Amino acid sequence: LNSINTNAGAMIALQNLNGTNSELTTVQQRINTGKKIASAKDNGAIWATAKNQS
């Protein structure tokens, strides 16, 4: 398929790039916070247990 209207390979390449960007953003947050569960979005059960313990 030598189409000029679509480019599927670019689509999968962009999906992979966004996955890498998401992983990098997660690592950024985990480094500048110092905690792997800094909010309820990280893991709700352990976050709630840690809030109660604190």
Added chain:
Amino acid sequence: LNSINTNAGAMIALQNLNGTNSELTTVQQRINTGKKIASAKDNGAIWATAKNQS
């Protein structure tokens, strides 16, 4: 038949030339649009499915 009023060979040649012209116009459309089914006339059912999917 050495007639001077009727020229059947010219008629057949014109029909063949018109067919070539139509094929060339179809290829011109398929190049400048980039679509083999750019309208309902090219293929009604596949064009309908493509409109719904888009």
